[model samples]
Target: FACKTANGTAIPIGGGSANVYVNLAPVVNVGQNLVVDLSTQIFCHNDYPETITDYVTLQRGSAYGGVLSNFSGTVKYSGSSYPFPTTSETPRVVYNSRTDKPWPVALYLTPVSSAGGVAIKAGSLIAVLILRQTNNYNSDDFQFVWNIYANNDVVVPT
Candidate 1:
């Protein structure tokens, strides 16, 4: 919660979605740029299918009193080939089809906010990450956990 990277984090679940995110410091050094390094990876899953989806939900918040839902940002090693919708929505990631393994496939997030993407929530900067495990003949009774990596450096206004 203190850091903004999904570092050393776990995504626990049975079937429904779960919340997870790298912490965004409301404040930072005057000279430092506000950039978040969020990364997620899928281990050897030779059984991944097209039915199950992995996603990042971008929710909406008003600029005045609500949260900032969009950013003129960039990504690295992206997983989703589909378009991110106009309004807030969960964008799905395209994974390695069967016959792929140990590539350590990942979704890299490099969101850049130009005087935006940072706002006050009623109670939290609570972002949710819904991750699901592979479904196959060999897969059963397992909940996925994020390979969490947390490296947060934050401070309140200068």
Candidate 2:
């Protein structure tokens, strides 16, 4: 799985092992909301259709001054029987000591249903996030980290 824009652009600017970043700091306004999507391709679970209810988490570090106001899984790439599950809870807000600003972190997205698991094939949209900027800032650097826990394994982005 990987992070991308709503239109599916993989924003990888560093070593693939841990660092996933945007190519450039897109100029965002205070009231603008940034839309992002998470997706997966391979079948990595022992279960026939993978259950991802508590299987995913997204974290961020030192957002200049923003809030993860919305988080949800999409049914964009699923069949009638097995679709991406519905998700709940917005990203948690925490104070970033370094930036002296509150940022969103540890977004544990829970599936409301889809108890049988989902068949997330190639290009399946896993989750969508909206980061709302609350204030303005100068050039600042932060990170968005993804975590997927499914079938007793932690799945990292490729």
Candidate 3:
């Protein structure tokens, strides 16, 4: 299912042992950094005895696939210490500052091998802003609005 963060960030969840994918389709000029805010909750059954751990991956795609960024965090249920079916709401703030080529960016979450974690919910919100270059005072010319929530895998019934 899709969950909205308190800050109005919409995240999609519910993906089987696969990468939870989201796309940021924005036109960016050369030498620009795109910032994105992400949050995800890993879940485990309270009755079952197991810990959940996973990581998120960010990639840049144009005509081919290439790795851009990768981030990870841990989720655990302390049995009696923490509540069962505990959720670890993680806020991931990152900047896409690569100037190699102008292309579309994609973000996904994957569970570590042998790591048992169900992505109960996940999503990201992005805000684009122009960055001033240090070389010259002249303003960089660029205009583009990205389409957030390009793809989601939440099991919301119609």
Candidate 4:
């Protein structure tokens, strides 16, 4: 779907619905603080121990790609697990842009990974909750969504 702004600029996501908004100004710049918000909700029936890993990647120009950081976290769904019907978590990541110029920040998640002998169940949602920059400039920020399925369905939804 495609949408147009008030000034008739094309917005490539969420159509023209109010669910999405694009800021014409650049959200990050040099020597600025990069803040990201993340959340996940899961539903499962079995007593599977789940481990989630979130990846933050940086892209320079049109070809450079590298891992910025890998965060390891766990969520267990046993009979005794609190917030049974639904579980939500928010993790904040602060990026200190002392060396790299703040072009646009990309957020990613591995969703489930296990060690030893534990196995995690399927179905998960790891979303880029929020992204903001301390400094302001007139530019563009690219938001991308990629999903890797157990059936090996790799999709770039953005």
| Winning candidate number (lDDT) | 1
- In model 4, what lDDT does residue 158 have? 14
lDDT of 1 by residue, 67-149 (tens): 22432322222343222212343342334345322222232222334333333332333222223343333344333323322
- lDDT of each prediction vs. the true structure? 0.32, 0.24, 0.23, 0.22
List model 2 lDDT by residue over 1-158, tens digit each.
12333233333422022222222113322333222222331111111113211121222122211111122222222111112232432332322222112112222222223211222222322333232221122232233333221122111111
Tell me the spans in candidate 4 whose CA falls farther than 4 Å from its real position: 1-116, 126-138, 147-158
Backbone clashes under 3 angstroms, per model = 15, 0, 1, 1
lDDT of 3 by residue, 89-136 (tens): 222212222211122122332222332222122343222111111112
Single out the weakest 10-residue window by summed lDDT for candidate 2: 40-49
Worst 10 residues of 3 by lDDT: 59-68
Cα distance off (Å), candidate 1, residue 28: 1.1
Comparison by TM-score, 3 against 4, better one: 3
Candidate number of the best TM-score: 1
- Order of quality (lDDT): 1, 2, 3, 4
Q: Is candidate 1 or candidate 3 better by TM-score?
A: 1
lDDT of prediction 2: 0.24
